[PDB]
Every structure is written in C-alpha cells, then in structure tokens.
Design an enzyme around this catalytic site. Structure first.
Site, mmCIF file in Angstrom:
data_model
loop_
_atom_site.group_PDB
_atom_site.id
_atom_site.type_symbol
_atom_site.label_atom_id
_atom_site.label_comp_id
_atom_site.label_asym_id
_atom_site.label_seq_id
_atom_site.Cartn_x
_atom_site.Cartn_y
_atom_site.Cartn_z
ATOM 1 N N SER A 152 35.264 28.030 42.729
ATOM 2 C CA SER A 152 35.687 27.766 41.356
ATOM 3 C C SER A 152 34.478 27.536 40.447
ATOM 4 C CB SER A 152 36.694 26.617 41.278
ATOM 5 O OG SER A 152 36.201 25.468 41.905
ATOM 6 N N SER A 155 38.904 29.992 39.050
ATOM 7 C CA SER A 155 38.820 29.913 40.532
ATOM 8 C C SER A 155 39.167 31.226 41.246
ATOM 9 C CB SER A 155 39.666 28.756 41.107
ATOM 10 O OG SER A 155 40.634 28.283 40.187
ATOM 11 N N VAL A 156 38.491 31.490 42.361
ATOM 12 C CA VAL A 156 38.687 32.744 43.103
ATOM 13 C C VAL A 156 39.309 32.511 44.499
ATOM 14 C CG1 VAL A 156 37.605 34.961 43.865
ATOM 15 C CG2 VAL A 156 36.675 33.841 41.866
ATOM 16 N N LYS A 186 41.007 36.341 40.913
ATOM 17 C CA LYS A 186 40.440 35.357 40.003
ATOM 18 C C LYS A 186 41.502 34.858 39.048
ATOM 19 C CE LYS A 186 37.158 36.154 36.785
ATOM 20 N NZ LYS A 186 35.804 36.075 36.169
ATOM 21 N N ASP A 211 29.920 40.847 38.075
ATOM 22 C CA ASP A 211 29.473 39.555 37.626
ATOM 23 C C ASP A 211 30.359 38.526 38.294
ATOM 24 O OD1 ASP A 211 28.628 37.179 36.270
ATOM 25 O OD2 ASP A 211 27.986 38.399 34.544
HETATM 26 O O1 LIG Z 1 32.777 41.191 37.995
HETATM 27 C C1 LIG Z 1 33.307 40.785 36.986
HETATM 28 N N1 LIG Z 1 34.421 40.006 36.989
HETATM 29 C C2 LIG Z 1 35.279 39.720 38.066
HETATM 30 C C3 LIG Z 1 36.650 39.890 37.906
HETATM 31 C C4 LIG Z 1 37.526 39.605 38.939
HETATM 32 C C5 LIG Z 1 37.060 39.122 40.155
HETATM 33 CL CL1 LIG Z 1 38.197 38.744 41.440
HETATM 34 C C6 LIG Z 1 35.687 38.948 40.321
HETATM 35 C C7 LIG Z 1 35.124 38.372 41.590
HETATM 36 O O2 LIG Z 1 35.135 39.272 42.680
HETATM 37 C C8 LIG Z 1 34.876 38.607 43.854
HETATM 38 C C9 LIG Z 1 34.822 37.200 43.925
HETATM 39 C C10 LIG Z 1 34.565 36.597 45.158
HETATM 40 C C11 LIG Z 1 34.380 37.399 46.280
HETATM 41 N N2 LIG Z 1 34.438 38.737 46.184
HETATM 42 C C12 LIG Z 1 34.672 39.358 45.022
HETATM 43 C C13 LIG Z 1 34.810 39.228 39.283
HETATM 44 C C14 LIG Z 1 32.667 41.145 35.713
HETATM 45 C C15 LIG Z 1 33.063 40.512 34.538
HETATM 46 C C16 LIG Z 1 32.445 40.870 33.352
HETATM 47 F F1 LIG Z 1 32.828 40.257 32.229
HETATM 48 C C17 LIG Z 1 31.445 41.838 33.311
HETATM 49 C C18 LIG Z 1 31.062 42.493 34.487
HETATM 50 N N3 LIG Z 1 30.032 43.458 34.486
HETATM 51 C C19 LIG Z 1 29.634 43.882 33.138
HETATM 52 C C20 LIG Z 1 28.333 44.656 33.233
HETATM 53 O O3 LIG Z 1 28.455 45.765 34.125
HETATM 54 C C21 LIG Z 1 28.931 45.390 35.427
HETATM 55 C C22 LIG Z 1 30.260 44.620 35.355
HETATM 56 C C23 LIG Z 1 31.677 42.126 35.686
#
Ligand SMILES: O=C(Nc1ccc(Cl)c(COc2cccnc2)c1)C1=CC(F)C[C@@H](N2CCOCC2)C1
Length: 351
Positions: A29, A34-35, A50, A165
């Site tokens: 979190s 939280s994830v 998430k 991210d």
């Molecule tokens: O990845 C993002 N969000 C996100 C959205 C949803 C989830 Cl579930 C996650 C986390 O993924 C996980 C967690 C724990 C374990 N494994 C995987 C992350 C991003 C959000 C942004 F606002 C931007 C972003 N990014 C922008 C620049 O280019 C690459 C992507 C990526």
C-alpha cells in the site's frame, strides 16, 4: 450484465471485486492506493489489482485518477504496461467512489536482476533495447515517464521487459532528500528545477540504468542533490555558456557558475572493459544539454543494438489527446470523466 462482486477486508480496507478475481493477497500500500496479487479465473492470468485510496478527495486527486486511467487505457505495447481490466462496484454515477485497476502481475524488477544476476553485454543490449523500444512508444504519444529507475522496470525469466510505474506514493520533498534511489536516476534539469523539461529526461535515466547494468553499481549515488550534481558534473563536465544560458533559474545558474570548471571524462576509463559501442551510446545519452541528448528513436538505430533492432517492429502510439492537462474542473467533473472511461473499457482481445 454487470458481473457479481464480493467483499473482503484486507488490512482494514474493504475490497469489492468481481468473482473472477480470486486468492487476493496484499502486495503493497501507499498514500495513493493498495495492491493485491490475484488469479483471474476468466483468463488464467495472475494479476495485480490496484485499489485507489480516496480517488476523488481533492480536485488534484480526482485529476490524478483521471490521468492514470487515460494513460493506462492508451498504453498498448509489448514493453509498456497494459490495462487488463478497470472496474467499480458502483452501479450508477451517484454511487461512484471507488476505482480498481487490473494489470499482469509483475514479480522481479531490474533492481532484482542487477543485484542478483551476472549480466552479459548481450543481456545489457537486450534490456536497454526494450526500454528504448518502450520509450519510443511512450514518447511518440507525448507521455513522459519522469521516474525511470530499475524498480519501475519489470523483467521476466526470458529477460523480457515492461515499463510501469509501481509508485503508490505522494512524491514529497523529504522522500527526495538524502542518500536515496528516488533521486539517483533523475535528469539534472528536473532534479534541480533548471528549466522547463521534456521527453529527454527519460533518456538521462536510461543512461543511468544502463551504466548500472554494465558495472552492477549506481552511476550517481548522491548523498544529496548538490553532492549528486558534483558527481554528475565530474563525469560529464561543467557546462559552457551555451547551456548556462538555457537554465531559466538565475539563482541555480549562479550556483553552477560557482563551480570549478571540469572536462568531460574519458568514459572508456570510467567503464573499463565495456563494449566500445556501449560506451559511445552512453556518451550520447549522458549529455547535460537535453537538446543534445539522443532520443529513443535515434538510439534504437545505434550499432550497439544491431542484433535486436528491427525498424518494422518498433511501433509508435495512437494520437493521445492530452488537452485535459490544461483544464480546470471540479471534483464531480473529473469523477464523471473517469466514470465514462471506466464504463467504456473494452478488454485486450485475450492474447
Ligand atoms: O504502472 C502504472 N500503474 C499501475 C496500474 C495498475 C497496477 Cl495493478 C499497477 C501495479 O502493477 C503491479 C503491482 C504490484 C506487483 N505487480 C504489478 C501499476 C503506471 C501509472 C501511470 F500513471 C503511468 C505509468 N507509466 C507512464 C509512463 O510510461 C510508462 C507507464 C504507469
């Protein structure tokens, strides 16, 4: 029509999710959410889910939520995180308070890989190739990561890479202070507020990451911002008049003119035994003047990636309408915007 949802308290937050998500296990979190790891019984994927912490608390909160949704709906690339699912348990717009995002579960970053694996030059080639391929995609839609670091790069067992991210947090002033990984990978113009920044800040971070993969050691482990600038400048040289003139901050410009002038080092004596092609690419990445930095698109054509480069399979993004970034709206306006987009999400074709 709507899937059935079920309730579960994990770490005194309630999770309401469709039944297709099973075996929910908390992973992290942070102030912004939280994830959980989960198993999607509909696709047979392991997923991360998430749940956004108070998505529409402020205007700036509601905008942030809208920003992440749009981004994640837009990104459809091999080396960039895609959205598998977004959902709300709300049945109408009036009920709408909660936002859940679903992606492929990552597990092991590049910070796991550089710490616990011997990497060959071919490994460094393949790794850096994929970031550059992803960045070419992100940048062609005018999206800037701003926070590229090994902990934001997701790497599987065949060394295949996704940019995401992972950040669940606020990004404050203290979290950037001291001997911290949150500041080692940043471009100097954005670390110090030198001028209005652009896409190339991401390239700086790539050169930072790439150095670290070649040596297994942080390129700029500054104990603070000023100590990190002294490191940077020792490697690459104090700037001349041409770059000094481009720094909008007169105060910060006055500080870099205080510094004893330094020549750019011999990178082949910093990076002892590296592929001279890796060296060359690093010198064209780690350039202080962001106008002079190599772009992702130009970097994918560098001879160092000859084994991987295919100009027929390094695609751009679709046009990304980012005009919302320059509008003022009320919470309920951001919320409704977010809501259209939730209700409109159409799944990846189950690839
Ligand atoms: O990845 C993002 N969000 C996100 C959205 C949803 C989830 Cl579930 C996650 C986390 O993924 C996980 C967690 C724990 C374990 N494994 C995987 C992350 C991003 C959000 C942004 F606002 C931007 C972003 N990014 C922008 C620049 O280019 C690459 C992507 C990526």
């Amino acid at each position: 029509e709507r899937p059935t949802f079920y309730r579960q308290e994990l770490n005194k937050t309630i999770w309401e999710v469709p039944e297709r998500y099973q075996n929910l296990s908390p992973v992290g979190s942070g102030a912004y959410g939280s994830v959980c790891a989960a198993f999607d019984t509909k696709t047979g994927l392991r997923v991360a889910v998430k749940k956004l912490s108070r998505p529409f608390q402020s205007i700036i909160h509601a905008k942030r939520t809208y920003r992440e949704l749009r981004l994640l709906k837009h990104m459809k690339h091999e080396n960039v995180i895609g959205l598998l699912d977004v959902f709300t348990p709300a049945r109408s717009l009036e009920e709408f308070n909660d936002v859940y995002l679903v992606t492929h579960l990552m597990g092991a970053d590049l910070n796991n890989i550089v710490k616990c694996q011997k990497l060959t030059d071919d490994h460094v080639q393949f790794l850096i190739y994929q970031i550059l391929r992803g960045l070419k995609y992100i940048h062609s839609a005018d999206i800037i990561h701003r926070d590229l670091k090994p902990s934001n790069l997701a790497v599987n067992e065949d060394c295949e890479l996704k940019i995401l991210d992972f950040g669940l947090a606020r990004h404050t002033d203290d979290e950037m202070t001291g001997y911290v990984a949150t500041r080692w990978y940043r471009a100097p113009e954005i670390m110090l507020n030198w001028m209005h920044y652009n896409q190339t800040v991401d390239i700086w971070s790539v050169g930072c990451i790439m150095a670290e993969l070649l040596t297994g050691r942080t390129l700029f482990p500054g104990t603070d911002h000023i100590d990190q600038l002294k490191l940077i400048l020792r490697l690459v040289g104090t700037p001349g008049a041409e770059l000094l003139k481009k720094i909008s901050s007169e105060s910060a410009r006055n500080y870099i003119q205080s510094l004893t002038q330094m020549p750019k080092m011999n990178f082949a004596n910093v990076f002892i035994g590296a592929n001279p092609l890796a060296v060359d690419l690093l010198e064209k990445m780690l350039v202080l003047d962001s106008d002079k930095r190599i772009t992702a698109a130009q970097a994918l054509a560098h001879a160092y990636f000859a084994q991987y480069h295919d100009p027929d399979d390094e695609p751009v993004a679709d046009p990304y309408d980012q005009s919302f970034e320059s509008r003022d709206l009320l919470i309920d306006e951001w919320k409704s915007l977010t809501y259209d987009e939730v209700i409109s999400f159409v799944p990846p074709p189950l690839d």
